[PDB]
Amino acid sequence: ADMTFWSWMSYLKELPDIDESRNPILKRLLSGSFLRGSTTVNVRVPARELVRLLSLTPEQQREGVSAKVRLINLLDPKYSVYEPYLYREILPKRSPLLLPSLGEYRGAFLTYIFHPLSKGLVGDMLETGRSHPDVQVLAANMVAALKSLHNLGLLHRSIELNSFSVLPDGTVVLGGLDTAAPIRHTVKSDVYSLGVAFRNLVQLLGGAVRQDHLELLDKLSQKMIEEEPGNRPTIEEIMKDPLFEGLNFEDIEEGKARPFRY
């Protein structure tokens, strides 16, 4: 649902405070020019005050956290609170294949979203050759993740390989949800974008990497990037592609896939 200026401003005020004097994020931002969309700050070793604010388990403490920060714009509050709004009001507390929030806060001039500190973005990881995943399972993980967003009535609208990230436990999740919007952009434009990401994946990978999986993914991606939306398969048709036969999609959707284990 699309709100009004006063709604967004009101919602901004409803976000809980964070204490910025007790917090190295501001210091890091002032020690450079980092602040642009959003800016990401990694906190590999959260301090006591941040551990308390987020109620981090010892496991979470060891994983680290990342903060997504945006400058509050008083002429357009939507830009700074849209993503917090999605996390608080629209997305389930834990959809298994979507990037989880650990908390949303407002300071004097910034909004904050905390995330688990990811092991990396999928595009970057494959590009550096750091990881050789099971192509079949990764592709299925990616389709499933998108489907889980469509089931909530949301398009992503900016899918790329780096939309996907690998959590410390090895779960691959869909992030970059600040561009998400209700179901011009349609389900078929998300199919196109995911197709382009698959093409990107095949170009990068031409351990668990199998040549027959790559050829099948290339064929699937060619269907997904058809110029005419009507000629592109639905998510349902994609899930019945030859590439995914023998896979239990229910397990993928529950978040049990680990495409980057050998």
Author numbering: 68 to 103, 106 to 252, 285 to 307, 317 to 372
Question: What did the study's authors say about this model?
Answer:
In the present work, we identify a specialized family of kinases that lack the glycine-rich loop that is critical for nucleotide-binding in canonical kinases, leading us to name them the With-No-Gly-loop, or WNG, family. These WNG kinases are conserved throughout the coccidian family of parasites to which Toxoplasma belongs and are secreted into the PV. Like WNG1, BPK1 is secreted into the lumen of the PV and is a clear member of the WNG family. As such, BPK1 shares both primary identity and predicted secondary structure with other WNG kinases throughout its sequence, indicating that its structure would provide faithful insight into the WNG kinase fold.
While we were unable to crystallize an active WNG kinase, we readily obtained crystals of the Toxoplasma pseudokinase BPK1 (bradyzoite pseudokinase 1). We solved the structure of BPK1 to 2.5-Å resolution. The BPK1 structure revealed a divergent kinase fold in which the Gly-loop and the first β-strand that stabilizes it (β1 in PKA nomenclature) have been replaced by a helical extension that packs against the top of the N-lobe of the kinase. Remarkably, not only do the WNG kinases lack a Gly-rich primary sequence, the structural elements that compose the motif have been replaced, resulting in a reorganized N-lobe architecture. The core of the kinase fold, however, is remarkably well conserved, supporting our phylogenetic data, which suggest the WNG family diverged from a canonical Ser/Thr kinase fold. Two salt bridges help stabilize the BPK1 N-lobe within the pseudoactive site, including the bridge between the conserved αC-helix Glu and VAIK-Lys. Notably, the lack of the Gly-loop and β1-strand creates an active site that is much more open than that of a canonical kinase, such as PKA. While BPK1 is a confirmed pseudokinase that cannot bind nucleotide, the other canonical motifs essential for catalysis have been conserved in other WNG family members, suggesting they may be active kinases. To better understand how the WNG kinase active site has adapted to bind nucleotide and catalyze phosphoryl transfer without a Gly-loop, we modeled the WNG1/ROP35 active site using the structure of BPK1 as a template. The rearrangement of the WNG active site has resulted in an unusually open active site that may better accommodate such folded or otherwise sterically restricted substrates.
